[PDB]
Amino acid sequence: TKCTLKSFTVEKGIYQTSNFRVQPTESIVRFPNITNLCPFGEVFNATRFASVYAWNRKRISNCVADYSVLYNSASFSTFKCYGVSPTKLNDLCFTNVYA
């Protein structure tokens, strides 16, 4: 108050010195239910696979692709990614994915 009034003797009354803003304590993130998963179990757990010369090209679109279940699995020997990071797979959007 002495800095606001620029005086060593403050009179009798009420003086507004500064303000007060309640800062956000938590940080919530809401989103709709994760439904209509991509059929990764159909191409990864397929009963009969094709040869290398007649490989199938399954189109994956209009679905949410959970790449966390593929990376967090010790059953796969090689999980190399080119031009993209394996961790940021769930934070990117695409138009269509071919398996």
């Binding site: 003797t9 009798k12 009420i14 507004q16 303000n19 803003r21 309640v22 956000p24 709709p32």
Partner: protein, 217 residues
């Protein structure tokens, strides 16, 4: 929606397709939860200025901190909330008497004995001062006196020279200011008493010549 506020349960009903809403002031008011399908109101958080309740520095140094429009549950002697907010450093005496220091919005503060106390103002009726038999001064004698009073009528015409005001003995400054337009003419016309016209760009054009040289082959 990237905002900041307190989410509480609402009593309104949205349409089966409307996600969020807004008030008349074009501000986000409510939003439907994407999972529970329930409407949650959005209220801006406590915004208020702090105040120091000081009974002067000549009496004592014991002061009280006053918060405006906020609740003490979110604020980091005696802690108690009031109608104008939370007051830290005072008492909560249930007595009531004349107001001494108006802290704002009802409750007042005062100094009583060695500590600062609070009390609720009743403000029954100001009409009680009518029959208070106040003293009225009735003159008895007079003395002839003269008074000289001067009231301005006209104003000296003040002109503004933007060239010398914005640019003090500078050439490139004036060269760059010449491209800002004829705003100085409008300022002078406004100072003389002529209103500025509100129209389109019928005198200023954003033209360009593209004097860039050709690159060598």
């Amino acid at each position: 929606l990237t905002g900041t506020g307190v989410l509480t349960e609402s009593n309104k009903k949205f349409l089966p397709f409307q996600q969020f809403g807004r008030d008349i002031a074009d501000t986000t008011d409510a939003v439907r939860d994407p999972q529970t399908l329930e409407i949650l109101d959005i209220t801006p958080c406590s915004f208020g200025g702090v105040s120091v309740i000081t009974p002067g520095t000549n009496t004592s140094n014991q002061v009280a901190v006053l918060y405006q429009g906020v609740n003490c549950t979110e604020v980091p002697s005696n802690v108690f909330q009031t109608r104008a907010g939370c007051l830290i450093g005072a008492e909560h005496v249930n007595n009531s008497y004349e107001c001494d220091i108006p802290i704002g919005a009802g409750i007042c503060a005062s100094y009583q004995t060695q500590s600062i106390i609070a009390y609720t103002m009743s403000l029954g009726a100001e009409n009680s001062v009518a029959y208070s038999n106040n003293s009225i001064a009735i003159p008895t004698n007079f003395t002839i006196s003269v008074t000289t009073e001067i009231l301005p009528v006209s104003m000296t015409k003040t002109s503004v020279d933007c060239t010398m005001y914005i640019c003090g003995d500078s050439t490139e400054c004036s060269n760059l200011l010449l491209q800002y337009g004829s705003f100085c003419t409008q300022l002078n016309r406004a100072l003389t008493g002529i209103a500025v016209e509100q129209d389109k760009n019928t005198q200023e054009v954003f033209a360009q010549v593209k004097q860039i040289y050709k690159t060598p082959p």
